[PDB]
Amino acid sequence: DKTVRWCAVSEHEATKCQSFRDHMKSVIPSDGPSVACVKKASYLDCIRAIAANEADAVTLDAGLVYDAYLAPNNLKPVVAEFYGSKEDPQTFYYAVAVVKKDSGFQMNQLRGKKSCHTGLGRSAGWNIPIGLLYCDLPEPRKPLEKAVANFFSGSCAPCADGTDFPQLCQLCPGCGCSTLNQYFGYSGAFKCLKDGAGDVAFVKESTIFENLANKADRDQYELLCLDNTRKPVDEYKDCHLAQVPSHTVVARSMGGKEDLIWELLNQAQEHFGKDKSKEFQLFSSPHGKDLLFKDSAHGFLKVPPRMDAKMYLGYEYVTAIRNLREGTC
Numbered sequence: 001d002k003t004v005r006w007c008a009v010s011e012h013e014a015t016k017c018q019s020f021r022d023h024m025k026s027v028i029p030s031d032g033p034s035v036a037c038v039k040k041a042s043y044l045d046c047i048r049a050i051a052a053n054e055a056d057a058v059t060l061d062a063g064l065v066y067d068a069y070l071a072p073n074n075l076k077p078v079v080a081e082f083y084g085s086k087e088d089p090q091t092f093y094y095a096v097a098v099v100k101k102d103s104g105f106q107m108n109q110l111r112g113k114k115s116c117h118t119g120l121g122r123s124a125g126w127n128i129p130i131g132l133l134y135c136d137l138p139e140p141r142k143p144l145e146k147a148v149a150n151f152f153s154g155s156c157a158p159c160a161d162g163t164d165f166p167q168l169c170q171l172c173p174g175c176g177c178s179t180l181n182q183y184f185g186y187s188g189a190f191k192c193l194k195d196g197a198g199d200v201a202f203v204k205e206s207t208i209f210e211n212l213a214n215k216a217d218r219d220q221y222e223l224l225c226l227d228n229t230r231k232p233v234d235e236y237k238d239c240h241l242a243q244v245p246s247h248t249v250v251a252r253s254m255g256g257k258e259d260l261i262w263e264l265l266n267q268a269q270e271h272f273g274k275d276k277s278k279e280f281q282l283f284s285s286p287h288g289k290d291l292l293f294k295d296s297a298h299g300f301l302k303v304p305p306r307m308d309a310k311m312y313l314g315y316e317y318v319t320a321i322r323n324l325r326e327g328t329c
């Protein structure tokens with residue numbers, strides 16, 4: 001019993017959140033957990049809000065989970081999304097590089113091309129691809145934003161500083177850090193490529209399938225494999241950049257309501273999980289893609305007692321992120 005203040009980032013998420021609140025009210029008893037919606041302009045305002053006791057929960061891509069863990073925020077992962085199916089839940093997904101068929105370039109010929117990123121600091125859209133290309137970048141590689149802006153001939157990296165690094169917002173003026181920016185997130189990064197703004201889109205394995213329903217339309221796209229070859233979009237298991245940890249809901253370390261957060265989400269997935277309700281869907285919405293939780297998610301799993309961001313993410317991934325921030329070739 002009692003309120004979980006969910007942090008909605010911008011308009012579309014705020015609308016889905018208010019719908020969430022309302023449908024949970026209709027099914028959950030007077031003594032069950034309820035939802036309140038707090039709207040912020042970016043995921044960063046959400047991390048700050050939670051730390052400052054203005055909100056309680058927000059789902060973050062694993063790469064952002066690391067930053068949220070850092071002081072002075074010190075937030076921790078409490079609930080994780082899982083993909084695949086309820087039968088064989090996957091707590092990881094694949095980072096892939098989508099390109100158009102016959103565009104004539106491999107992963108080793110990305111210099112000078114235009115790039116579409118989900119957002120600065122995110123797993124598939126930034127950490128993995130930029131980590132792999134790091135030494136191919138021109139010195140000085142610090143700041144990273146400058147070396148990246150100089151490698152490609154223009155990009156859309158939502159949440160990046162357009163003032164200091166304009167080329168990083170060339171494909172999406174302003175580098176908006178929410179769904180208000182049409183080239184934000186997985187589906188936004190894919191639109192950026194489909195529209196012809198960029199040459200490559202750093203997204204996950206399900207993105208193209210979530211956007212193009214016909215196989216004939218998807219046959220016009222390919223994946224860049226690490227062995228400097230290309231494979232069709234269905235062969236991502238044999239052509240991906242890396243496997244990354246699933247998105248996770250984070251909360252305060254003190255007075256964080258993690259029990260209530262789990263109680264709310266567990267009930268939520270039961271009533272509004274995949275194929276559960278005709279009235280409301282937790283993992284989809286007429287208002288946009290990946291709002292509050294990823295559309296590709298099938299449910300939630302509780303994170304073990306007192307697990308910190310570092311242990312949750314793993315040694316490898318945390319090293320990848322570290323090596324990107326300082327990093328020596």
Ligand SMILES: [Fe+3]
Pocket residue numbers: 061062122123124247
């Ligand atoms: Fe992600």
